[PDB]
């Protein structure tokens, strides 16, 4: 049923969101490192 | 159409081909297909319920004489560059045969006249200086000049 | 004239570049016709009585009539169910698709009561089109 | 004609006992584009240029023909200007806007070095033997036009500056580019009331041709059809009205290099008391509404049994052009009068 497959994306939109929790700026450096050589 | 009387006069009117399907042999579906075109075809008409020769030159010429400034005329049929002479002016021009004065062309007139097509303006002991209006719809107009094979836009000053 | 036509062409020719395809689809014509019809255009259309857009009234006007239609050669829940169907590649959450929902049982008895283009036949009454909208 | 391969010429041979080349010509030309038989007709007529003549070196009787192309906007006139200048061995392209008197003319100046009188040839001199394209020619200054008609009537410039009496070669077939005043030609009036341009100018033209717009939904899908069709054909990735296959643009060029350079035709078979006939009645029909319109239609049938590569000119030639100069001068008149212009005319058009 189309509600069955809508709930389980936003059950793995919540946990991907959980996720991202996790400060970008961890990220943005990782992204620097490779561009400060 | 929201008259009482009108819609109940149209249901009358078509209730009889409403019935056919079913005697032919409850289908909804089946009868709107059925009657659906029909509809439309009475929805097409909801309130409503051959001249001479020369009458249909007469008449063109009118039609122009009476939508077009007199201004352009010339700019229209002089080779080189409303009153009753403007009007046999406009007919001489037009008119690729030479056309005699008889008086059947003046009995054509008349007769124009009183079959409303034609509306006199001026007095009617004044018949040195007679005044006329056309009153005819242009599509009839254009449809009489498609079966004279003459092709009046190419003339008609405000088109342009 | 033919320039125009030309600048159709481009533009379809745009739109296949902007979204990177290699070959040019009818959807890119379908958009650049709107483009160059509208010419003189507003600032901004009205609401429509919650209040929905005019462009996206006519959208959904035309998506429903163009199913009907096509259906000629239904019934009210099923043409919703279909619509729901159909725009599932956009609603992300539930509360997205009760506005839906909404959205869509306004329309549709909007245009049966007030446009006229939709007419009932008889808790699941039958719609047909109205046979004079093109 | 030396650097010439024989099977040039024996192509060029076995094409001209063709009973359709002229078909096959005409469409050979402007493929792109789709309709228009008679503005292609006209210029592939002055393209292959008439004989030049000198009657006792007394007057000098000019062989070249100068094409007057008016159009509504909208009619690519600009791409056939364009493919002219593309086919030609010697084409030089300008336009109204930067084109002066002066530099369109040799002009005097002193050298920079030695100071003394030099002539710096314009764009026509260098145009000799040669073509000329002139586009947007309504917008030419009047003064600017003033100078035109010598090259054009004389096909020589007399240059008299700074105490320098010189004359110079300008034997070219000009070709000239025009747009209604307003934009939209009206056929309510003449055609010298439409086109900003005098009396005399006109005159020094040969053929005119007046493009209109119509709106006709089996033309306009035959139109979209056959540009559609050229758009899908010449992507870079991806790289008839007579119903006959155009030819090869190399061939075409070597035929006509091989008709200018070899063919000088003879007019001994023409009838006078026919061309008598009908130059009364145009003068009967031009007073009711001269010698260089016969001249024209001349060199004309000179030019087209040049097309046929025939020494001697068969009187279909003398037809042909008849027909097409008719076409041309009925196509300038008002509506109210080219029905019966037609109607009189009906025994050459057909
Ligand atoms: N009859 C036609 N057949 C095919 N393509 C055409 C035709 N008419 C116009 N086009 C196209 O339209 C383009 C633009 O036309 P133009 O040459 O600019 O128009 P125009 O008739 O020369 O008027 P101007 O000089 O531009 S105001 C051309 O490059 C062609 O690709
Ligand atoms: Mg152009």
């Known amino acids: 049923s189309q509600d069955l497959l809508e709930r389980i994306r936003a059950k793995e939109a919540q946990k991907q969101l959980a996720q991202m929790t996790r400060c970008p700026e961890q990220e943005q450096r990782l992204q620097r490192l490779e561009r400060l050589p | 159409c929201r008259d009482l009387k009108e819609l109940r006069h149209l249901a009358v009117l078509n209730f009889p081909k409403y019935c056919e399907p079913v005697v032919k042999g409850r289908d909804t579906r089946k009868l709107w297909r059925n009657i659906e075109p029909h509809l439309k075809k009475a929805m097409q008409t909801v309130y409503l319920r051959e001249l001479p020769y020369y009458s249909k030159f007469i008449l063109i010429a009118a039609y122009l004489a009476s939508y077009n400034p007199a201004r352009t005329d010339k700019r229209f049929f002089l080779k080189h560059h409303f009153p009753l002479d403007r009007l046999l002016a406009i007919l001489y021009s037009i008119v690729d045969s030479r056309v005699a004065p008889t008086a059947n062309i003046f009995s054509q007139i008349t007769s124009l006249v009183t079959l409303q097509l034609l509306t006199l303006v001026g007095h009617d002991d004044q018949l040195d200086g007679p005044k006329y209006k056309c009153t005819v719809s242009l599509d009839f107009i254009r449809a009489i000049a498609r079966t004279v094979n003459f092709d009046i836009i190419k003339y008609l000053y405000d088109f342009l | 004239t033919v320039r125009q036509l030309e600048s159709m062409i481009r533009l379809s020719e745009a739109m296949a570049r902007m979204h990177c395809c290699d070959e040019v689809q009818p959807k890119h014509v379908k958009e650049a016709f709107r483009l160059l019809n509208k010419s003189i255009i507003r600032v901004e259309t009205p609401d429509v009585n919650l209040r929905l857009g005019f462009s996206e009234y006519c959208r959904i006007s035309n998506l429903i009539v163009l199913h009907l239609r096509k259906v000629e050669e239904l019934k009210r829940s099923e043409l919703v169910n279909w619509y729901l169907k159909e725009i599932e590649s956009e609603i992300d959450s539930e509360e997205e698709l009760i506005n839906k929902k909404r959205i869509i049982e306004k329309v549709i008895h909007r245009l049966t009561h007030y446009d006229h283009v939709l007419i009932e036949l008889t808790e699941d009454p039958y719609l047909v089109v109205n046979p004079n909208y093109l | 004609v030396g650097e010439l391969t024989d099977e040039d010429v024996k192509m060029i041979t076995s094409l001209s006992k063709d009973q359709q080349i002229g078909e096959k010509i005409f469409a050979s030309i402007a493929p792109s584009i789709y309709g228009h038989e008679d503005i292609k007709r006209g210029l592939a007529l002055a393209l292959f240029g008439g004989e030049p003549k000198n009657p006792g070196g007394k007057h000098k009787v000019r062989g070249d023909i100068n094409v007057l192309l008016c159009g509504d906007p909208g009619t690519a006139k600009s791409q056939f200007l364009k493919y002219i200048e593309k086919v030609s061995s010697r084409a030089i392209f300008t336009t109204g806007q930067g084109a002066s008197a002066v530099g369109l003319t040799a002009y005097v100046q002193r050298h920079p070095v030695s100071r003394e009188w030099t002539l710096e040839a314009g764009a026509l001199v260098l145009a000799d033997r040669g073509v000329c394209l002139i586009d947007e020619f309504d917008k030419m200054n009047d003064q600017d036009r ?204 057909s």
């Open chain 4, 146 to 349: 003033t100078s035109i008609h010598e090259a054009m009537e004389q096909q020589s410039i007399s240059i008299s500056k700074a105490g320098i009496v010189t004359s110079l070669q300008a034997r070219c077939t000009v070709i000239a580019a025009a747009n209604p005043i307003g934009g939209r030609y009206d056929p309510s009036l003449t055609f010298s009331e439409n086109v900003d341009l005098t009396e005399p100018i006109i005159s020094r033209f040969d053929i005119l041709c007046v493009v209109r717009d119509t709106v006709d939904p089996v033309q306009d899908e035959m139109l979209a059809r056959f540009v559609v069709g050229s758009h899908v054909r010449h992507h870079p990735s991806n790289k008839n009205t007579y119903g006959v296959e155009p030819l090869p643009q190399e061939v075409l060029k070597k035929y006509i290099i091989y008709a200018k350079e070899r063919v000088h035709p003879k007019l001994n078979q023409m009838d006078q008391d026919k061309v008598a006939k009908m130059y009364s009645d145009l003068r009967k029909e031009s007073m009711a509404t001269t010698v260089r319109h016969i001249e024209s239609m001349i060199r004309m049938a000179e030019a087209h049994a040049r097309i046929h590569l025939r020494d001697y000119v068969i009187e279909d030639d003398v037809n042909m052009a008849i027909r097409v100069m008719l076409e041309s001068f009925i196509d300038t008149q008002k509506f109210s009068v080219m029905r019966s212009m037609r109607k009189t005319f009906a025994r050459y058009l």
